[PDB]
Amino acid sequence: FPRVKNWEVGSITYDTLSAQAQQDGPCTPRRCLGSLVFPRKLAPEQLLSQARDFINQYYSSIKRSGSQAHEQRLQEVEAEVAATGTYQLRESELVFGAKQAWRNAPRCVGRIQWGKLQVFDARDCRSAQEMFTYICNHIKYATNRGNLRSAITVFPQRCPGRGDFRIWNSQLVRYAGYRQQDGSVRGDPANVEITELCIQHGWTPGNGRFDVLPLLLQAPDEPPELFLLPPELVLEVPLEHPTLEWFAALGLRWYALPAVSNMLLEIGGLEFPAAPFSGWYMSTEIGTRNLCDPHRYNILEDVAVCMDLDTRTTSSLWKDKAAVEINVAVLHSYQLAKVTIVDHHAATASFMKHLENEQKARGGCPADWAWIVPPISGSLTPVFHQEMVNYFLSPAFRYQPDPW
Ligand X SMILES: C[C@H](O)[C@H](O)[C@H]1CNc2nc(N)[nH]c(=O)c2N1
The identity of residue 364, as a single letter, is G
The identity of residue 18, as a single letter, is S
Binding span for a second copy by CB under 8 A among 121-129, 217-225, 274-282, 338-346: 338-346
- Of the CA atoms within 13 Å of residue 278, those in its CB half-sphere come to 31
Residue 387: name its binding partner from ligand HEM, ligand KLY, ligand X, none (Cβ under 5 to 8 Å by kind): ligand X
Q: Show the binding pattern over residues 192-211: x = contacts a second copy (CB under 8 A), - = does not.
A: --------------------
278 makes contact with ligand KLY (CB under 6 A)? yes
CB atoms inside a 10 Å sphere around CB 335: 13
Least spacing, CB of residue 74 vs a second copy, in Å = 26
Residue choice 285, 325, 343, 358 for contact with ligand HEM (CB under 6 A): 285
Residue choice 87, 168, 280, 318 for contact with ligand HEM (CB under 6 A): 280
Decide if 99 contacts 114 (C-beta within 8 A). Answer: yes
Least spacing, CB of residue 77 vs ligand KLY, in Å = 30
- Where is 107: in which H helix or E strand? none
Residue choice 244, 248, 337, 370 for contact with a second copy (CB under 8 A): 370
Residue 110: name its binding partner from Gd ion, a second copy, ligand HEM, none (Cβ under 5 to 8 Å by kind): ligand HEM
Which of 73/296 has CB closer to ligand X?
A: 296
Which of 225/387 has CB closer to a second copy?
A: 387
Decide if 148 contacts 339 (C-beta within 8 A). Answer: yes
- Note if the bond before 395 is cis, omega within 30 degrees: yes
What is the C-alpha separation between 74 and 85, in angstroms, rounded?
A: 15
365 is an active site residue = no
Which of 101/226 has CB closer to ligand HEM?
A: 101
What is the C-alpha separation between 159 and 157, in angstroms, rounded?
A: 6
What is the C-alpha separation between 217 and 230, in angstroms, rounded?
A: 16
Query: How far from the centroid of its chain's Cα atoms is residue 25's Cα?
Result: 19
279 makes contact with ligand KLY (CB under 6 A)? yes
3-class DSSP state of 202: coil
3-class DSSP state of 397: strand
Q: Show the binding pattern over residues 30-49: x = contacts ligand KLY (CB under 6 A), - = does not.
A: -------x------------
Decide if 277 contacts 397 (C-beta within 8 A). Answer: yes
Please tell me which residue in 93, 103, 111, 125 is annotated as part of the active site.
111
Closest CA to 90 of 68, 116, 72, 113: 72
For the chain, the residues before each gap (C–N > 2.5 Å) are 42
Residue choice 177, 279, 287, 395 for contact with ligand HEM (CB under 6 A): 279
Determine the length of the chain.
404
280 is an active site residue = yes
Binding span for ligand HEM by CB under 6 A among 77-85, 101-109, 177-185, 356-364: 101-109
Dihedral sign of CA atoms 284, 286, 288, 290 in order: positive
The identity of residue 254, as a single letter, is W
Closest CA to 145 of 252, 226, 273, 235: 235
Q: For residue 118, list its beta bridge partners.
A: 151
7 is an active site residue = no
Query: How far from the centroid of its chain's Cα atoms is residue 14's Cα?
Result: 28
Please tell me which residue in 102, 168, 280, 318 is annotated as part of the active site.
280
Residue choice 5, 70, 90, 107 for contact with ligand HEM (CB under 6 A): 107
Please tell me which residue in 103, 108, 125, 292 is annotated as part of the active site.
108
Which of 180/243 has CB closer to Gd ion?
A: 243
Residue 7: name its binding partner from Zn ion, ligand X, ligand HEM, none (Cβ under 5 to 8 Å by kind): ligand X
Q: Which amino acids are annotated catalytic?
A: 108, 111, 280, 285
Residues that bind ligand KLY (CB under 6 A): 7, 37, 170-171, 258, 260, 277-279, 281-282, 285
Residue ranges that bind ligand HEM, judged by CB under 6 A: 102, 105, 107-110, 113, 117, 150, 152, 263, 277, 279-280, 282, 285, 289, 342, 347, 371, 397
